[PDB]
Amino acid sequence: ECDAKCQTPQGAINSSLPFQNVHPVTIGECPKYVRSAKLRMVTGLRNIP
Amino acid sequence: ADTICIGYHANNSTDTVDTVLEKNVTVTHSVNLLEDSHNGKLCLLKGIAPLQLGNCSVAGWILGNPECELLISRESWSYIVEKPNPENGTCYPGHFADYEELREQLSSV
Amino acid sequence: QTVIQEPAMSVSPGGTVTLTCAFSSGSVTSGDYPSWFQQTPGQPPRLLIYRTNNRPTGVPSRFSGAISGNKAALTITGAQANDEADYYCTLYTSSLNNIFGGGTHLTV
Amino acid sequence: QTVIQEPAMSVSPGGTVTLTCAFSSGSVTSGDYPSWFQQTPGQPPRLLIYRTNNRPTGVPSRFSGAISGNKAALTITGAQANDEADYYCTLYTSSLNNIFGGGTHLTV
Amino acid sequence: QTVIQEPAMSVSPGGTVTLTCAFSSGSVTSGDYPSWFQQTPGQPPRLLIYRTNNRPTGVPSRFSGAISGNKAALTITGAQANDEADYYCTLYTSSLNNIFGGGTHLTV
Amino acid sequence: EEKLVESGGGLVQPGGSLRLGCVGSGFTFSSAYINWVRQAPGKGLEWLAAIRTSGGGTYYADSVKGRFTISRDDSQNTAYLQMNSLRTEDTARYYCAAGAMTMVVASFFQYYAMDLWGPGVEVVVSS
Amino acid sequence: EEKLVESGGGLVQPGGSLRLGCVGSGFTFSSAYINWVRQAPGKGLEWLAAIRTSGGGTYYADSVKGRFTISRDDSQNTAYLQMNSLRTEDTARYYCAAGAMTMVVASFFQYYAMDLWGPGVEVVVSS
Amino acid sequence: EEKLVESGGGLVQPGGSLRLGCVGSGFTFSSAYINWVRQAPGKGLEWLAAIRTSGGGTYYADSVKGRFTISRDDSQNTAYLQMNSLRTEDTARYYCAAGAMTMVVASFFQYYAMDLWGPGVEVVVSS
Amino acid sequence: LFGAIAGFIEGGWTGMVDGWYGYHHQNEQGSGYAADQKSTQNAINGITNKVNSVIEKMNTQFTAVGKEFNKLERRMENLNKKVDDGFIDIWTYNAELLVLLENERTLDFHDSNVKNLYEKVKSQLKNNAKEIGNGCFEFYHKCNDECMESVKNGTYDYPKYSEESKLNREK
Amino acid sequence: LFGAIAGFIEGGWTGMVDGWYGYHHQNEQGSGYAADQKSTQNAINGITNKVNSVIEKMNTQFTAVGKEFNKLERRMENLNKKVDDGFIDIWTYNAELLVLLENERTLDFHDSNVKNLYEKVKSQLKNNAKEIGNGCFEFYHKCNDECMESVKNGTYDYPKYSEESKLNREK
Amino acid sequence: LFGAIAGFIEGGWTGMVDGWYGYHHQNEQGSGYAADQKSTQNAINGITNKVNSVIEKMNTQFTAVGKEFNKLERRMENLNKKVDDGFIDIWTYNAELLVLLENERTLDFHDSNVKNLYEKVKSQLKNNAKEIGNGCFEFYHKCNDECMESVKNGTYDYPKYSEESKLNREK
């Protein structure tokens, strides 16, 4: 009885992120599917300890 | 004498990011823009539950298959869930006309 | 220097309030970083608004903060009758030096 | 110091001209921002090309300007017989100090 | 400041190699820019790896370079039986000043 | 599960000395600015002192500037307010506050936000 | 309807003085540089003076430096060229030009572009 | 097409002198740093000298510093190593190397890479 | 690149745990680490808007991307496949390039913040202190905790310490 | 960011109406406001080409989006809807992000231009003038309108006033 | 823009043929041209990575972009044409703007590298050299080949020349 904005044949996605790589076939207002395995945005600084 | 230095932050983070000028840059903090995980379970959609067909197929359910009794009550559904290879569809062999179109029009009601 | 605040104020249930906090000096800006606190009887204060307009996660989206003219304003819309508490304002005169106001006793 | 121009020129209708403007000194550069002016007798001058390439809104797309070698050049192609006027060139030696040319009396 | 290298090694065909090169000083880093060379009898030396990892166009993707701890390591994987040659390492001390190694003879 | 607990306090004669201590759990105590605030009985709040992290500095109010000292021991996750030459107007409930509100773009805590408060400790000064 | 109208002029004996005036309408006069140019009868144009906005400066040709002065009143949209000790060769038609071409990326007026000209004013210096 | 050919060499008595030459063909010799290396019979490689382009400088190894000088003549695509005060241990095969490896993002040659080598010349010193 | 991070300020500080940029002080009262609240807060606001802009502009409409076609409709299967593959290609390329460029911009932003803090402290101190390199100033006078906080909080009061500094600078 | 706008130069001048960047002089004759025409013109050219590049890079062919389908063709209608919504989403995201990033490029460009102007004037004046903050120079010598104009167009002649500036400085 | 290229350093050097950034020395032994290998190598790595990122982030799948339809299917053909034209428009816009912006970024990167090299040499020389303008420093001592190579390779040893530079500077 969970609620989700996007449904996938392997299970729903409960996230607000702009991109996903679970499955191209999805139902609902879903994050855009990409063929990327990493999408990390730097928020901080270079680490030089 | 008395000194004051200006500097910046550093920590034990091992997070790495890719930039247009360099790859594998270790950074203090980063955020993820990519979702890689799912629930593993079917959830509701727009507050309206899905329609689960069980072992029946769309043709079997809509024709009223004799082995399709449990799924008899529904008013409005947001999508249909069907097995990859249903085993109770058209019990009498035959051809279903415009089956794909019917599946498209019965997707949500 | 010294922060002035209304000694007391009363509002009806389901109404808006305009709890104000001012300096005994020139204008109050966003660089003073007003922070509002709510205290009930026998209980540690609770932060409601930080840096003029920000809410902590637990605070419901009913308290709001702003700057109005030369004063710091906190407004309550829903007034769910659990808001009968003392509301304090603090103004930062330095990086960590801050001055608390007198406090307003809000009767619903 | 002084700006040299052609005393007079003539062109048949439907033909191109090469009205040139230079210094009585070294080379003319795009940093001098030449501007051409068309004056008929009894009328104020009209700006035709500014900053050696740019035409105002009203000027027809017939007068072109460039820096050919070491001398600024204005070219007219259509020659619609309303081009019979005195053409002047101005060269800027400072932010606002400019030197005008003698004038090319074009007859069509 | 001298370069130390292992006088000899042997490897079976289709076997891994762990050729190594070090200083008689502190750690060898990427700032020393090691470069390996393969020399067969009476033949000009040949560059196999520059800047600890880069391989020239002709070199097969069998030789590899890395900085292991305080040493520079050349790894040979295929061992195609034409690797019976002396292997040298050069470590750079300035911009064009560099010290060559003693050399390792690899009997395949 | 962020928690601050204040110790010390009680009855002390005028001109005496106390040492109040606030112990923090559930969060990185060494990364949070620690404030000491007092509330006199039947009176409003009064900010008293503050201490930064990694020896950044100590900040005092004019009421107790020179009498009260503030320190911290991160190995024990404790913050100490040592009060000296206490007068009769120092009778109050003392709270330790910590700026311990997390962000999304950094691992630090948010500035200008006393989010975490302790239950308080009573300090009374009388004969 | 941008427009510049000259004013003044007439006949003045050698060694006299005048104050030519140029009044502008249809554009922000205070934002436009003002140039004074002259044309002798049967002779080419001769640039004489220029004034910038907000007291940026006054630029004079070497021919008329010291004798002619330029000024502007932005409260009346007026530009004044005051001529002192006029010689007999100063007889000409005097034009006031202004750089008043607009661009799409800014509210300023284009540089090195004397587009807006006045009809001119006659000045005759004779006995 | 890239080629370096050595010249000079031979037998010279101790205390003498030589001028070894390296001629480059098939590339821009004036844009490539030139190195001189030696290999003694039955011994490892020994880097001797290096010369930059456009008068950048000359770099010498400690063993041969002072005795050997290095120069280049770009009009003939030649590099010269002049040896003076020869000793008995200088007999070896002498190689001229050059950095002639090209890159995709620029027209220069790769740094820290001696890619182009020559056959070398034998130099035998003996009484 | 502006030269501060991995430049004339070689490495970061593990001891400064309360902000991105800050100050180390060595007076006779003691040494310590203090983050600059103003610059770090401005950077925090900027990066939070950056992340929220990248995330919150992906407003999508309820769509289903799965369709079924039989064998006599194969041109339809291929057209649908082309549509889906083209959209995936566009979004993958856009997301990758967006992250790649945005990360470079963020690192440049932090570098600019450190250099501007350094420049501000330099202009505040003027000739009362000397640049000893590595982003550090050695004072020509004695600074107590009040002096250090004045430098940090932005009100240094140069004329108060100028004259004494001269007696140490011309010596 | 480069630190000039909303930095060591606090606010703008409503007096300067003829350009983006410029000078404000104060002599005995009077004060004023003059725009630097070279830097302003370069900035105008750059911004105009940026706007034109954004506008004129959009080229389309004659197309009609609208299509009509009957009841027995719903996979058609859904595929058409998908292509339309996908194109709209891609273009919306691209336009929003392009404007967002180009605003930071333009503001950084203006900040860099102001800082470059300041540095040019500083290198021209050298030790003949003193920096008193806020992007403002105080001359050690006596300047008239010729000196001010000379500083403004880029021909200052430092040796002319070097001796007098040395006499006034070392006093 | 950082002000180095086309700024206080007006033109480039055709004689320096071994790197992007470098030095021009003059001693009694002669003048020359030597590139800074560290800065040029870092720039080469960055630009190579940029080109590789632009080229290699396009991963495609086997597709055939041609369909034939009979005269009774015009909605089919128009939908296919709309798909193809939309993809072409999106890719043209993205590619053109990406190139246009990456070019400014690369030029700014080179400008920053030149300015940073200038600042590095400035900080190492300190008051032992006089800034004579145009990226040029005149020494207050005497620098043979070894001294200049020390300046280029990053180990100048200021205190060795500190005393003599005083006597020649206060004169």
From TrEMBL, chain A:
- Which domain of life does this protein belong to? Viruses
Where does this polypeptide localize? Answer: Host apical cell membrane
What function does the entry list?
Binds to sialic acid-containing receptors on the cell surface, bringing about the attachment of the virus particle to the cell. This attachment induces virion internalization of about two third of the virus particles through clathrin-dependent endocytosis and about one third through a clathrin- and caveolin-independent pathway. Plays a major role in the determination of host range restriction and virulence. Class I viral fusion protein.
Q: What binding partners and quaternary form does the record give?
A: Homotrimer of disulfide-linked HA1-HA2. Interacts with human CACNA1C.
Q: Give the family per the record.
A: Belongs to the influenza viruses hemagglutinin family.
For this entry, the protein name equals Hemagglutinin
Organism, by scientific name, is Influenza A virus (A/Solomon Islands/3/2006(H1N1))
Q: Which gene encodes it?
A: HA
| Portion held of the full protein | 290 to 338 of 565
